[model samples]
Target chain A: DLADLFPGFGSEWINTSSGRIFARVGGDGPPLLLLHGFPQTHVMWHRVAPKLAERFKVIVADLPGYGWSDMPESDEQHTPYTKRAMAKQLIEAMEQLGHVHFALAGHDRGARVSYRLALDSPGRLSKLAVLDILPTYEYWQRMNRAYALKIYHWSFLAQPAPLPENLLGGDPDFYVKAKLASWTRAGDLSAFDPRAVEHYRIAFADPMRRHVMCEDYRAGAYADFEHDKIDVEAGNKIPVPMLALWGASGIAQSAATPLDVWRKWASDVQGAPIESGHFLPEEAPDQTAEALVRFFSA
Target chain B: PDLADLFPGFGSEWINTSSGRIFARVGGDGPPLLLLHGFPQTHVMWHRVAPKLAERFKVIVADLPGYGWSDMPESDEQHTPYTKRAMAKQLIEAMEQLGHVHFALAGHDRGARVSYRLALDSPGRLSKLAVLDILPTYEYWQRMNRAYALKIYHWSFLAQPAPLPENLLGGDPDFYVKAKLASWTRAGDLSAFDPRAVEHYRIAFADPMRRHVMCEDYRAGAYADFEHDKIDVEAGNKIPVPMLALWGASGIAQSAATPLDVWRKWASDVQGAPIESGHFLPEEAPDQTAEALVRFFSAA
Candidate 1:
């Protein structure tokens, strides 16, 4: 149905340890893998992916527990949903697709996965660009009243099992739209394509997917936080040229300085604020694509 | 009809205040005593304890605004109408209307939040102050680590912007209320609560407006309430009246910090120990809770 959004791109369901990952592959030159964030699928990259495909072989995939991707069975530790586990499965999918090394760009939750991948699999990524997020460790460490209010979902969604699921499931469409609208600089759905909004709504309508989203946050609050903490303690940093791009009015800018925060994790990091909100690729696709192309091409 | 049988011989009245009308039950003899019930409960929570405490003191048990049988005032972005300061002011007017300038106040859960705020704001109006199973709002937020966050998730979840929490909870109000009541009690079931009282709570939750107001109550706790307490904490403003802090032995407050230790920081004189209950102390351990209240309030 959304094939019209991407004209020349071909779709594939790649197998991984978690399950099948749905990705749209197109573009020509260097390999670039794109990942989407919470409550959204790879469709988030439809606008930017086609443009970037002109210069690079782009693969925009849905993270597990999202979109058409299989919802892996979660555990007490939420192992399957942790950025580490997700990053691992993504590497497997990329290798199976015959691109062992690639440039990576991820937004929101996907950005979390992208950074974790760069940290865990240093040799696998030539460059990494994280959009609209600070490290999970930094988020938890700085959860004062203002930040906590800004990102209440980090705590609300991370609540045990059925509570968040039941609450959100009551009206998934409203919750999804409310969340998207709130995060946008325009404070409405005007920035998003109606089809993309519908795509996100359908994904959230599935209770299992909603539960998976909660598990993702649980992992953020617990496992991912611990992983980042251990790395920080041991002085582990992303061993690649990292590009950190955030929306001018996005959640990441809520931090004192996002570039300063990213520099603590990556040795070579350069970033600037795109003139948009949280959904940079969708809200400002041209600027988003240009930034990524310039960063990865160099 | 009204569940008045729980409090035989007590007269019920709807008193007017500057902001709204408050429903309260007045009974008993000696000095004026006001009992405030907490979240998901009403004056009905004091069914067992009020009569016992009434033997030595007049007991005026009322629902906090935006709760059972009380006017649900519209809350602003600051949630000022639901703040303990506002609720405390309404109660002061309610108590004065009932002809009591000074009363011994005992409050549980959200009511405890109001009780402490009143003591701090109107120091000369209270003979003694008793707060059950809670610390200052500022202290709670300051100590909201992972464990406490999970334990009191509703503090944040309910405070979420407007209709999200309201809509989600509206789908199954009874289930949500029952589950919350059961989980926070020493017994992990509805065995401790009266069927009639639980029904009263269900009535309030079934209304979407009340649910929004309840969320506003928590929103206030997170914002305005936190600000008021922070000002007091920073300025070293302690409650001038004697304070009693009684907590459920396995209650939420104890899990965060020692109840007395935390209360001592906010009050000039403080003394308390744990009741053999969870959170609903008045219902779960009424006799001991009453005994403790009587001893503390009746003291020289």
Candidate 2:
């Protein structure tokens, strides 16, 4: 049922020292690696990737523990799922795919890894584009009652591993569907394609995936934030030029301006709010792809 | 097991309210003093402090609605049924039923929220207020940040609409309950809690029905309760009753914000000092917690 969503694309389970990663590849131009956010998989780019394929080779991979990717057990500090580990593994995967350096675009949790990749392996990412998020440091510094309520799940999933894994695993589909529906501007499931939603349901129904996603967040709140803080202190900035796009109707635009925030971490940055919600790729695929294609083209 | 095992000679009784049944114990003979227990605990939480205070005042210990052995009530949009307001109403009815129209009230954790609310909403009914380990709702909302948010993230998680928190918490009630009790303590484990008390906590936590009701308590903290507090703060509703605030030295209170400073803004006469312990002040330092209560309400 989930297979037909990504027509003309081939899937593979790439193995590295980090873990096995599942990704779908299509298109045949400059390599453009696409990483997805929480509660989703490579299928998130079905609408956008095919379009961008006309100009760029699009590689979409499930974040480890997210779709079909191998979910390595989380350590005490959630190191296994850290953006650092994910960044290293995916970069290695890209190298094996025969693209040592490529244009990268990530949304939601994917955007986190993209930014971390830009910092940790600065030379590897040719041009970076992040969808619907800000630097971790900016988020931690600017959190308020309003912001805390807005992103309560970050803390919820960040709780000691088994706690979040237990709760989310109990009702994975319900939790994932709620997150997708609420985060959109319509505040319903209308924006997501029906087949894509089905894929999400199938992907999240696995208990291991639910646990892996929580570990992803657990690392985001701890290790990722720690690494970003140290980078900020040591003056290690993202040397590559980046584009930061936010949904006009999402928390990113409302709580904190995306462009101003990106300027804090990167030496060269440019971005504006696209007319959409948190799920930028699916909700406004054409606009999102247009921005990415234009940014990479430059 | 009855509270009498720990709180010797106290008589147990059930008080009826509009919501449901509320279990309580009343003992000693002097000024009426109502003691309310916090979350994941019952009236049994006061087992140590109440017995010591029974000598001076008539000590009444009871469970907050939807916690411990108390009857669970249905929740609404504002979580009204589990609001500190609603819980305070039930405690008030219980005290009035016990023939005490006016009483001195002291509470810890969730109980503390109820005590302060009771003092605000029905000032005439309360003589003195002693809150252990928290600040007023208005101040909490005003000064909340990531540092404090991390320490008390449950306030946000539990308050999320309905089945979400309930289902998550139901996954492993024992682990969730013990982790909370452990994390908030200075020792960072269950060493401070008595064996029987821990057993009661586990039994209560393991019950599926308690999940919704307990989550509703926190839901109220974020929504309706916070709104109610905002209105009172705007109306300059200072707790007219003499208020005593005691917090844990090594707990979130020490690291998050100054409790006395925050309390002074909400109450007319407020005095507090840090007890040498953690968030579970009563369980961690019962003698110190009891002594502070005795000294704070000595005039009674």
Candidate 3:
């Protein structure tokens, strides 16, 4: 499916001891890996990945339990879906790809995973860029009614299994498409390429993926949040340079400032808004790609 | 179904007061019993329970000022315009106009908030007070947590600076009303409710004015109401009237917090237990709701 998006790109399943990964690899310079956000596959990078590939070897991947990747059975703490587990999977898969040191860029959930990788395995990253999110620790601390209302899915999905799974099971397609449309700047499906949209729909149609996907958020609210707190309390800091990019038109534009929030967690952090909504890689791929290219190259 | 179909031959009258015009339904003559309905519903919340209670007491069912067919008065910066204090005063005026200077009062949900307020602010006007499925608004805010907030997100959402909630809720008021009715009930849907009453609730809440007003009621709960509750606690004030507190065994009232314990702190004389249903006690368990009300009212 991504082959059509990134013509001539090599699509393969990279197996790790943890789980199998679905990825599209191409280009020939420095290693640069792209990670996608929630309720989305690596196709979010289709518009931006090819451009990055022009100057670097791009490894665009669907996080495990997302896209075509296999979803391992989750633990009571959902550690398997926690960004730390997810980060290890990416590291091992990238190790298999012969890129032990690579530049990393992620959007939303992927951005979260990228940061965790930057923290837990700082030696593995050359430069790190995260798009459209605050650190999980910062998120929990800044709880308010408006933020709670806007990010209700974080809590709704994180509820003990079978509850969110059952409610979401009522009508998965409508719920998935609603998030896409509602979060986009244009406030409709028009901003998305229909082909990419269909892929997202297909990925979520699987009941297992639906549960696994919820597990991803479940980890964010609990395990991942706890881990971030430990890191914050212990004064653990990102070793590599960090870049933060967020939507110019949504919550980041008003509710929370991406740069200000990220600055507290990293040393050399700098970024600005991309001319888009939450789905930066797709909605305004050109601006997003330019920002990522400028940051990762530096 | 119209009020005429559900409450055939019941007296329908409007009592004008300084705050606003009140819509009321009166039937069965005995001791004066004022019945108040909650958010997203009309006075018809008592369609099943009031008629039964009316067999022994004069039943007076009226919508809260910002709900049902009542007037949509503008809310102030502190949201006091829709505060239980203000709403309680209006209810007292309406009750007095009907010549029931002192009457037994039972309110469910939003109405229950007003009933407790009446017991505190206008103690002489109420003979007995029964508050259903809620606590003092202050206790709720002080004890709020992730689980509590997660279950009652609408409380926060509605309390948001307006036009935001008003627009979001008004998007599909009927669907919004139905979703709340289903989730707040033990059955998880409308199966427990009478189909006709459910339809009436849908029609009644579908009005844009009612949606805005319903949000204002919750906004008041978060703002002015919580402040008033805080003042009462600091002043060491308690409800002077005999009080009965009942909550759904599995709803937010019981699952998220203790209704009876919170009531005991605010009422000098309070006694209550779990009802067989969820938040909509009158509609979900009319016989039990009426039995509790009749026994409690008859005792005084």
Candidate 4:
């Protein structure tokens, strides 16, 4: 149904060691993988991917436990949803598609996976562009009163199961709409496609999906955060060319000098802000596509 | 009507303050003693210990604003209306109107926050102070690591911008209250609370406005209250009165830091220990909680 948003793209269910990942694959030339963030799927790239497809093959995917993707059973340590685990699965999915290496751009949680992949598998990505997110370690370390209030869901969702799940489950539709709208520059849903919004609402309405989403945050709080910290302490900079793009009015911009922060994590990194909010692909598709095209093309 | 039977001899009154009218129950004799209750609970949280405490000290059990039977005042951008400082000021006025120029104060949970702020801001008005099952707001935020964050997730969850937490919690208020009470107790069930008190808490939570105000209470804790504590900590302003810090041995505060150790940083004369219970010490371990309070407040 969501395929209607992404014209000329063929849907495929790619199997990996972790699980089957549902992705929209189309376009031509070198592979360019596009990963989405929380409360959304590959549909987030519906507006931007078609343009990027003109020059580069764009693979838009729903991360595990998200839209059209298999919800893996989470472990006690939430190991399955960690950025490292997610990065490995994405890599396997790409390898199965006959691309041993690729260029990648990810938004929000997906961006976390993008950087993790670049860190763990050197030479796997020709370029890494992370959209609208800072490293998990950086977020936790900077959680003062102002930042904490802005990203309260970081702690709220990471609460041990049932509490966040039940509260969110009460009205997933309202929760989804409210969450999406609040993160945008306009503070409304006008920027999002109605079809894409419906898809997001449907995914969140499922109780299992909601639980897995919380586990993703739990992984961020515990496992992913620790991983970033370990890498930081060891001076493990991202091995690939890094492109950091954040929304001028997004959560990432709330931090002082996002580019400077990324510089500390990657050996070679450059980026600028898009004139949008957190959802750059949806909110400012043309600008997002232009930035990605320029970065990947170069 | 809900808790009238629990406090049979106590006279109920609504005292007017600068912010709004506060609901209180007055009883007993001797030195005036104020008992303040915590979140999702009313003044009735002290029902188990109040009767025993009444025999020794004149007990005044009052609900904090935005809580049971109290006015839910309009909140501002800073959540000033819900700050512990605001609540403490209103309560001090309530006490002054009741003919008590100075009184001994004890509070639990959010009420404990108000208790300490009152002691800090108006040091001459209180002879002694007892805070139950909490550290200062500054200490909690400063020590919020992964483990502690999960334990006090509501600190962030409830403080989220209005209409998000408000709407979600409105979905099933009773469930949220019961779950919160059960999870925070040592027994992990409703057994620690009196049926009457639970009913009262449920009634308060069932109201949408009250729930909104409760969220503002935490919002204030996260913002205004944190700043207030920071200023005090930085200026080396300690509670001038004798301080008592009683936490649940199996409570949320202990998991973060030693209660006494943290309190000592904010007070000159601090002494107390954990009761053999969870968060609701007055209900879970009334004998120990009452004995500890009587001993501390009754001292020379």
RMSD of each: 2.0, 2.6, 6.2, 2.2
- Residue range B70-138, candidate 2, lDDT tens digits: 788877787898888888988888788888888999988889989999999998998899998888766
Please give, as one word, the docking class of candidate 4: medium
* Winner by TM-score between candidate 4 and candidate 3: 4
Off by over 4 Å in 2: A1-4, A231-239, B1-6, B18-20, B232-237
Residue B38 lDDT in candidate 2 = 81
Top candidate when judged by DockQ against the true structure? 2
Residues B138-180 of candidate 1 have per-residue lDDT tens digits of 9889987655665787888788898878988875677888878
For each candidate in the order shown, give its overall lDDT on alpha carbons: 0.89, 0.84, 0.82, 0.89
How far is B67's C-alpha from truth in model 4 (Å)? 0.9
By DockQ, the candidates rank as 2, 4, 1, 3
Clashing pairs in 2: none
Please give, for residues A1-298, the per-residue lDDT of candidate 2 as tens digits. Answer: 6656668888878886777788888888889999999778889898998887887888899887788878877788888789998899899888888888899999988888999999999889889999998877667666677777778887787777667777676667778898898889898899999899998999888877777888888787788889988988888878889999999987677668788778878999989788898999988889998998899884
- Per-prediction TM-score, please? 0.95, 0.92, 0.70, 0.94
* Candidates arranged by TM-score, highest first: 1, 4, 2, 3
Minimal lDDT window, size 10, model 3 chain B: B1-10
Q: Once superposed on the true structure, which residue ranges of model 4 sit more than 4 Å away at CA?
A: A1-3, B1-4, B145-147
Candidate 4 residues A151-243, lDDT tens each? 888888887777788788778899999989999999999999999999898888899989989999999999999999999999999979989
